[PDB]
Design a protein around this ligand. Structure first.
Ligand SMILES: *[C@@H]1O[C@H](CO)[C@@H](O[C@@H]2O[C@H](CO)[C@@H](O[C@@H]3O[C@H](CO[C@H]4O[C@H](CO)[C@@H](O)[C@H](O)[C@@H]4O)[C@@H](O)[C@H](O[C@H]4O[C@H](CO)[C@@H](O)[C@H](O)[C@@H]4O)[C@@H]3O)[C@H](O)[C@H]2NC(C)=O)[C@H](O)[C@H]1NC(C)=O
Ligand SMILES: *[C@@H]1O[C@H](CO)[C@@H](O[C@@H]2O[C@H](CO)[C@@H](O[C@H]3O[C@H](CO[C@H]4O[C@H](CO)[C@@H](O)[C@H](O)[C@@H]4O)[C@@H](O)[C@H](O[C@H]4O[C@H](CO)[C@@H](O)[C@H](O)[C@@H]4O)[C@@H]3O)[C@H](O)[C@H]2NC(C)=O)[C@H](O)[C@H]1NC(C)=O
Ligand code: NAG
Ligand code: NAG
Ligand code: NAG
Lengths: 388, 146, 49
């Protein structure tokens, strides 16, 4: 019998956040299957955390460690995840990250594993895509000041190749991006790389539809992985060039069945049809949390001697079984919703994965190629013209 | 205190508040600065920052001052210096990844002016600037911002 | 040349098909052009007359 420390942000809404409901769904679906962990049940302790208060995250992590957990699941903010990473590196318990965060190269920590795909590999995929599309002047539009280091391999890319990068910043609201779009139209920009949330992507698509940007002359590339959850119905007949990446392996039938089984439980939560988004779709954060709980349970299955003990924040005795269980974490090869899962032996980041290059046609969103870190970019549609 | 142990920063800040101080002169290190900023803002303590850190815009802490000058105004000064020198090709060399968050509108300056730009990053080793300086010599780039 | 209801449906379908650029100068023979909601069709460079 084990416990997991779930830390999630609360809204004072009707339902919880999708990360917390995905955590509960992961626990229930793992405990239903007797194939995985037949001799040990799994429990959890959720904690509802505020907006950007890492001390409150430190206190709730201290309360969870006073209870004692097998592993913790950190929040989505950068500062609170840094505090939880420092606490779990000090006390030797594993820390699992779902949202990407900025990391400092001079931070000697080892008790953290993030299953988000690394933005260096994502930027290399974006570089492969823009070299296939043969642009010369690309406008990169980012959301916030943390967006540059997610694209820092792309901004270093015109050192090696001929490429122009006029980089513009989104304002404090998405609805006030009309002067940015007028400056975009006046400068004759035609190939725009967007790096923001999917909500900001829907907002900038509505703002561009008010601006008349969606013609045949415009190509849009999105670094966000929630492109498949967007609504492309009033954009598909306009004849545009929207192209993105889908980490979620929706081709498999069992994965689609699990997606439908989670989505029918999401139907208690009502949608907002004015936002330009769909409903009944698993987000990348929720799917990554589900796969994280699966990978942690796979790491538990190789450990028969597992015992959860209480710990104190005022004494720096580390947890007893931290090193062997962390060694069991970093050698996993579990096939989750996001395909293969394998972390880096030097950082622990998920820098090796599989990506679905989805694009937009008038039929709708459609996969046209695959991307991998080893062979680069395949492009099955362009691979059909392969001579003998 | 040691390097980049924000848990140790929270523990020693808790010990100093257990003693009780009028103010806290915080560290010059980003994760510990964020932890001490959360500690002091949640406890009503004045906290002083003397080195620049990356600041998240969504953070609602107002219980601190930063005596280091804000790097947006330094980037405005650097842009004014570059526009005074009438340059066209500028190479920017940065070591830590937060330098791009530091140098914001210098990167955003080709959208506003006719200033062509290229950046390069120093590697994690100090001595390995020789391939970078060899690339600077081979690129025939005469205006370097460090 | 149609009714204003058909004109509004035509303009909605043309905005959906990306016909709202600077390269379009539609002239409507109907006398109820002022009754249209032109707010989603603004900021697009069209020239309704
Ligand atoms: C307290 O904190 C607030 C918030 O940060 C500060 O307010 C900012 O102050 C800076 C001071 O430089 C302002 O920067 C200046 O903005 C002027 C207006 O910008 C226009 O254009 C931009 C881009 O399109 C728009 O986003 C903006 O809304 C305006 O339409 C610029 O004209 C200034 O440029 C001038 O000085 C630079 C110096 O390098 C020259 O190079 C230029 O040629 C030009 O002469 C400059 O960029 C910033 O806009 C303010 N933001 C806000 C939110 O107010 C306070 O200054 C700070 N302290 C004080 C005193 O309250
Ligand atoms: C754990 O993390 C480590 C740090 O990221 C990983 O090490 C790095 O892995 C990448 C994987 O692509 C290696 O590839 C990169 O560099 C090669 C070689 O470039 C050469 O010239 C550069 C200067 O121009 C040097 O800086 C390099 O060191 C090197 O001498 C590039 O060819 C790669 O790009 C190619 O591959 C990508 C992905 O398919 C494509 O998108 C590109 O188009 C291109 O085909 C990368 O830039 C990198 O060399 C390696 N080293 C480091 C520290 O960066 C490590 O692999 C990882 N391991 C695990 C287990 O995950
Ligand atoms: C992309 O734009 C080019 C412009 O010539 C067009 O030929 C091509 O069909 C477009 N593809 C997509 C994805 O719309
Ligand atoms: C690309 O996809 C095709 C699909 O048949 C596959 O055969 C090939 O091995 C893949 N790799 C390449 C060549 O990119
Ligand atoms: C359409 O209206 C705009 C309003 O500024 C005007 O400038 C333009 O000359 C008009 N005619 C066109 C675009 O043919």
């Amino acid at each position: 019998v084990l416990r997991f420390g779930g830390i999630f942000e609360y809204v004072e809404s009707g339902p919880m956040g999708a990360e917390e409901l995905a955590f509960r769904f992961a626990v229930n679906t793992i405990n239903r299957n007797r194939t995985l962990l037949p001799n040990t049940t799994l429990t959890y302790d959720t904690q509802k955390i505020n907006l950007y208060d890492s001390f409150e995250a430190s206190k709730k992590a201290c309360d969870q460690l006073s209870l004692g957990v097998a592993a913790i699941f950190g929040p989505s903010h950068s500062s609170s995840a840094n505090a939880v990473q420092s606490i779990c590196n000090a006390l030797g318990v594993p820390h699992i990250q779902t949202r990407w965060k900025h990391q400092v190269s001079d931070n000697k920590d080892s008790f953290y594993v993030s299953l988000y795909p690394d933005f260096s590999s994502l930027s290399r995929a974006i570089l492969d895509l823009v070299q296939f599309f043969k642009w010369k002047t690309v406008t990169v539009v980012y959301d916030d000041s943390t967006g540059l280091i997610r694209l820092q391999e792309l901004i270093k890319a015109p050192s090696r190749y001929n490429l122009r990068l006029k980089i513009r910043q989104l304002p404090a609201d998405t609805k006030d991006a009309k002067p940015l779009l007028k400056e975009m139209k006046r400068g004759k920009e035609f190939h725009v790389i967007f790096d923001c949330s999917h909500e900001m992507a829907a907002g900038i698509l509505k703002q561009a539809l008010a601006m008349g940007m969606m013609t045949e002359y415009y190509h849009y590339i999105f670094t966000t992985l929630d492109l498949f959850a967007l609504d492309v119905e009033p954009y598909r007949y306009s004849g545009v060039n929207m192209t993105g990446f889908r980490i979620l392996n929706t081709e498999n039938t069992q994965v689609s069945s699990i997606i439908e089984k989670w989505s029918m439980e999401r139907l208690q939560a009502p949608p907002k049809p004015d936002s330009g988004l769909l409903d009944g779709f698993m987000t990348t954060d929720a799917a990554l949390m589900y796969d994280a709980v699966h990978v942690v349970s796979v790491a538990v299955q190789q450990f028969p001697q597992m015992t959860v003990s209480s710990l104190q924040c005022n004494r720096h005795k580390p947890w007893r079984f931290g090193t062997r269980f962390m060694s069991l974490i970093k050698e996993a090869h579990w096939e989750g919703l996001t395909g293969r899962i394998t972390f880096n032996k030097t950082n622990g980041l998920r820098t090796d994965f599989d990506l679905d290059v989805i694009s937009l046609k008038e039929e709708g969103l459609e996969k046209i190629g695959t991307w991998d870190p080893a062979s680069g970019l395949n492009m099955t549609e362009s691979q059909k013209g392969k001579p003998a």
